[PDB]
Amino acid sequence: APKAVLVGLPGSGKSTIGRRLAKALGVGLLDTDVAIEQRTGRSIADIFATDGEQEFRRIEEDVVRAALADHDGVLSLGGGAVTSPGVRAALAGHTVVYLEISAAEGVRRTGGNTVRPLLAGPDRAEKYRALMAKRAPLYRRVATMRVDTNRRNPGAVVRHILSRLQVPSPSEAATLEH
Ligand SMILES: Nc1ncnc2c1ncn2[C@@H]1O[C@H](COP(=O)(O)OP(=O)(O)OP(=O)(O)O)[C@@H](O)[C@H]1O
Ligand SMILES: [Mg+2]
């Protein structure tokens, strides 16, 4: 089972923390969005446009379940996987690290806000606020560790996680005797 499954909004650090944590632990890194593309030979966008969100979620759930079973390293989940009840079921029992971020920081860390075409319509910051409102409660539900990334740089985030993922060595005593 993965050492850690990372979940969070866009810009929360799934890629950055994924790499740095996997480096610190000396383990493999798998991202479920990349894994879907690798297993199908189709872009995420194409699967959505062509098959619809529900079939994307189906493919996604199979990939997530396989990775939870087979991957021993760090796993990062695509943002919407937790919307599938079967994915929430599959995660139960795993180490699930929720990288927390505010709307303002999430927008900044994903390229900033956009020009607003119509005063009466929404801008990028407002769309992000909507995604947060819907996703954040689900990340909270599935989490076993919550880490605020708003005021910690990536090195600090990784050190915080490592301090809470420790594994005692069962052969520790004997090692000192040989
Ligand atoms: N703890 C942090 N403090 C400050 N900046 C950060 C932190 N974590 C990540 N960043 C920066 O925020 C940006 C987005 O990070 P990253 O791509 O890792 O997020 P992500 O969760 O993978 O996003 P996406 O869901 O779009 O794949 C990058 O420029 C990265 O350097
Ligand atoms: Mg990423």
Model description:
This is Shikimate kinase. It is found in: Cytoplasm. One of its GO terms (cellular component) is cytosol. Pathway: Metabolic intermediate biosynthesis; chorismate biosynthesis; chorismate from D-erythrose 4-phosphate and phosphoenolpyruvate: step 5/7. Monomer. With 178 residues, this protein is of the alpha/beta class. It has one domain: Rossmann fold, CATH 3.40.50. The chain has 9 helices and 5 strands; from the N terminus they run βαβαααβαβααβαα. Strands 2-3-1-4-5 form a 5-stranded parallel beta sheet, sandwiched between helices. Helix 2 crosses helix 4 and helix 3 crosses helix 4. The radius of gyration is 18 Å and the shape is globular. The two termini are 31 Å apart. The site of magnesium ion has 2 residues, from helix 1.
State the gist of this model:
The chain is α/β, with parallel strands linked by helices and 178 residues long.
List keywords for this structure.
9 helices; Rossmann fold; binds adenosine-5'-triphosphate; magnesium; five-stranded parallel beta sheet; 178 residues; alpha/beta; globular; binds magnesium ion; magnesium ion binding
* N-to-C span: 31 Å
Largest sheet: 5 strands, parallel
Radius of gyration over all CA atoms, rounded: 18 Å
Query: CATH architecture, please?
Result: 3-Layer(aba) Sandwich
- Biggest sheet: strand arrangement: 2-3-1-4-5
Associated small molecules: adenosine-5'-triphosphate, magnesium ion
CATH topology: Rossmann fold
Q: What is the top-level CATH class?
A: Alpha Beta
> Outline, from the CA principal axes?
globular
Structural class by sheet pairing and helices = alpha/beta
Q: Work out the helix count.
A: 9
Strand segment count: 5
- Tell me the name of the CATH homologous superfamily: P-loop containing nucleotide triphosphate hydrolases
Q: In sequence order, what are the helices and strands, one letter per element?
A: EHEHHHEHEHHEHH
- Strand residue content: 5-15%
Helix content range of the residues, please? 40-55%
Number of domains: 1
PDB class: transferase
Keywords: transferase, aromatic amino acid biosynthesis, P-loop kinase, metal- binding, shikimate pathway, nucleotide- binding, amino-acid biosynthesis, kinase, magnesium, ATP-binding
Assembly: monomeric
Entry title: Shikimate kinase from Mycobacterium tuberculosis in complex with MgATP, open LID (conf. B)
